[PDB]
């Protein structure tokens, strides 16, 4: 018996409306057959369409549109449907569907101008309800209404060619591993031997004043230049502490809290990072809270590192790749890094207007996608490297910390394709 539906349309142009109509007709309990309904094609669909129209199709639905009005394939299935119309002796067989307002009823195909069409130009819901009312009027065979099949075929056909897939992928990060730390942290007994109204930022190596003890990893007599009074300190007065257990967190005393002891470490790391990048002779821009460092035009060969560009030219303003480093010890010992972009009018003086700087940065980032960001970040990190596999932060005469020049690798089991 005939219980299937044929819907003719322009596949490259009328995909949306045909898909919606097929989905709703299936959900309402009708066996819908369409070209876009099935995923994959063979040489046999040319005969398949004709045999379906001749034997299994009980009724023809045509998507009337400017693209589908005069399409050779559309006209050929229209002719097959029309001949089936003649041999079936069923007047209510061809049901055209006009969905284009630009296609007037006086410009439709000759085989359609004499057939009543359901109006979809104004309201699609009204057209669908008219289709329904006509269909229950014509006693067309149907099954129990069930949208489960609708959603089913929705997943297997639509959105199936591109979705989530399972495959392992390697991932990087802006986190930088720290290879090593000094064996012990030194608190030196200075008291008057260090002036009370003295700032520790200008001192050579990083050092922070906690209570009366100077917090640094360096040797006691390393601060002779900035502190001439420090020539006669007794190293036995140091309360040097095994930093390894500080990282483990096992240490605890009334003298210092482990959270507070770890508090002093990150500030020392930040000061060492700032001092090291000062040693690299790189300029700086003042941020609201942090400090960002960029490169001039001429410091690098062609203002580029490796095969990667780091400083470019845009109209009359020079954009410079910049970084900002923060030391965090909670998840892992990591010198965290961030990406920032700043502009210079001549390449040596920074623009003092914040609004134009922000506008230029966002304009340059508008077209900046994934790969360029990673390339420039990794290039700058490799530029600041002291060795092939790591770079060190100078914060003592014999005390050093090694930080990997390679960002922290991560592994993800789920990815996709373009």
Partner DNA sequence: AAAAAAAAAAAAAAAA
Which residues sit at the interface with RNA, rule CB under 7 A?
A: 196, 209-212, 260, 263, 285-289, 340, 354, 357-358, 361-362, 365
Contact call for residues 144 and 137 (beta carbons, < 8 A):
no
Taking the CA atoms of 229, 235, 238 and 244 in sequence, report the sign of the dihedral they define: positive
Would the annotation count 359 as a binding residue? no
Angle between helices 148-157 and 15-27 (to 10 degrees): 140
Nearest to 176 by CA among 308, 323, 341, 305: 323
Residue 297 Cβ vs other proteins, minimum distance, rounded to whole Å? 25
Within 141-170, the residues that bind other proteins by CB under 8 A are 147-148, 150-151, 154, 159, 162-164, 169-170
Would the annotation count 9 as a binding residue? yes
Distance (Å, whole) CA 7 – CA 352: 65
Within 183-222, the residues that bind DNA by CB under 7 A are 201
For 267, the token pair is 């500030």
Would the annotation count 238 as a binding residue? no
Would the annotation count 46 as a binding residue? yes
Q: Residues 334-363: x/- map of binding to a copy of itself (CB under 8 A)?
A: ------------------------------
User: 137 contacts which partner out of DNA, a copy of itself, other proteins, none, CB within 5 to 8 A by kind?
Assistant: a copy of itself
Taking CB under 8 A as the criterion, the residue among 72, 91, 202, 316 binding a copy of itself is 91
Distance (Å, whole) CA 343 – CA 271: 26
Residue 129 Cβ vs a copy of itself, minimum distance, rounded to whole Å? 9
Would the annotation count 77 as a binding residue? yes
- Cβ neighbours of residue 335 closer than 8 Å, sequence gap 6 or more: 176, 178, 269, 273, 325, 326, 327, 403
Contact call for residues 308 and 257 (beta carbons, < 8 A):
no
CB nearer to other proteins: pick between 266 and 336: 336
Q: Residues 362-381: x/- map of binding to other proteins (CB under 8 A)?
A: ---xx-xxxx-xx--x----
Taking CB under 8 A as the criterion, the residue among 35, 56, 111, 130 binding a copy of itself is 130
Nearest to 409 by CA among 218, 178, 247, 174: 174
Within 4-23, the residues that bind other proteins by CB under 8 A are 15-16, 20, 23
For 348, the token pair is 């040596």
Q: Of 67-75, 177-185, 356-364, 397-405, which segment contacts DNA by CB under 7 A?
A: 356-364
Distance (Å, whole) CA 251 – CA 245: 6
| Residue 342: burial class (beta carbons within 10 Å; 0-12, 13-18, 19+) | buried
- Cβ neighbours of residue 140 closer than 8 Å, sequence gap 6 or more: 30, 58, 59
Q: Of 41-49, 53-61, 173-181, 355-363, which segment contacts DNA by CB under 7 A?
A: 355-363
Residues found in the chain: 418
For 394, the token pair is 């100078």
Distances (CA, A) of 154 to 4, 26, 377: 19, 11, 42
Binding interface with other proteins (CB under 8 A): 15-16, 20, 23-24, 27, 122-126, 147-148, 150-151, 154, 159, 162-164, 169-175, 326, 331, 336, 338-339, 365-366, 368-371, 373-374, 377, 407, 409-416, 418
Binding interface with DNA (CB under 7 A): 201, 263, 266-267, 270, 289, 326-330, 355, 358-359, 362-363, 366
* Numbered residues of the known binding site for NAD(+): 8-9, 11, 35, 46, 71, 73, 77, 105, 115-117
């Amino acid at each position: 018996m005939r219980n299937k539906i044929f819907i003719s349309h322009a596949t490259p142009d009328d995909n949306d409306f045909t898909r919606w109509l097929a989905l709703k007709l299936i959900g309402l309990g009708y066996e819908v057959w369409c070209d876009i309904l099935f995923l994959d094609k063979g040489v046999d669909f040319w005969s398949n369409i004709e045999k379906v129209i001749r034997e299994d199709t009980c009724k023809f639905l045509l998507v009337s549109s400017s693209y589908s009005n005069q399409r050779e394939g559309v006209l050929k299935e229209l002719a097959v449907a029309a001949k089936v119309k003649k041999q079936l002796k069923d007047d209510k067989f061809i049901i055209p569907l006009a969905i284009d307002e630009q296609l007037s009823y006086d410009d439709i195909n000759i085989d359609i101008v004499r057939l009543n069409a359901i109006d979809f130009k104004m309201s699609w819901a009204r057209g669908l309800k008219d289709i329904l009312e006509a269909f229950e009027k014509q006693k067309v065979p149907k099954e129990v209404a069930d949208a489960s099949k609708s959603n089913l075929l929705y997943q297997q056909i639509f959105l199936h060619d591109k979705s989530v897939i399972e495959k392992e992928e390697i991932y990087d990060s802006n986190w930088l591993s720290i290879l090593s730390f000094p064996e012990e942290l030194r608190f030196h007994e200075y008291n008057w031997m260090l002036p009370k109204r003295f700032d520790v930022r200008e001192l050579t190596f990083p050092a922070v004043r906690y209570k009366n003890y100077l917090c640094t990893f360096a040797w006691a007599y390393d601060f002779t230049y900035h502190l001439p009074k420090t020539e006669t300190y007794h190293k036995s007065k140091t309360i040097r502490i095994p930093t390894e257990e500080i990282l483990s967190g096992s240490y605890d005393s009334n003298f210092i809290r482990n959270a507070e002891c770890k508090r002093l470490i990150v500030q020392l790391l930040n000061k060492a990072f700032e001092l090291r990048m000062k040693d690299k002779e790189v300029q700086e821009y003042e941020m609201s809270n942090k400090t960002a460092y960029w490169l001039e035009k001429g410091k690098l060969e062609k203002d580029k590192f490796e095969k990667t560009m780091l400083v470019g030219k845009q109209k009359d303003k020079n954009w410079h790749f910049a970084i900002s480093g923060a030391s965090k010890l909670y998840p892992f010992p990591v010198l965290m890094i961030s990406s920032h972009i700043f502009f210079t009018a001549d390449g040596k003086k920074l623009i003092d207007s914040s609004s134009v700087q922000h506008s230029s940065r966002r304009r340059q980032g508008k077209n900046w996608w994934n790969n360029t960001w990673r390339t420039k970040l990794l290039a700058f990190i490799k530029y600041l490297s002291d060795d092939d596999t790591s770079f060190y932060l100078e914060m003592g005469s014999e005390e050093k910390v090694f930080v990997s020049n390679e960002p922290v690798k991560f592994k993800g089991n789920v990815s996709y394709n373009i």
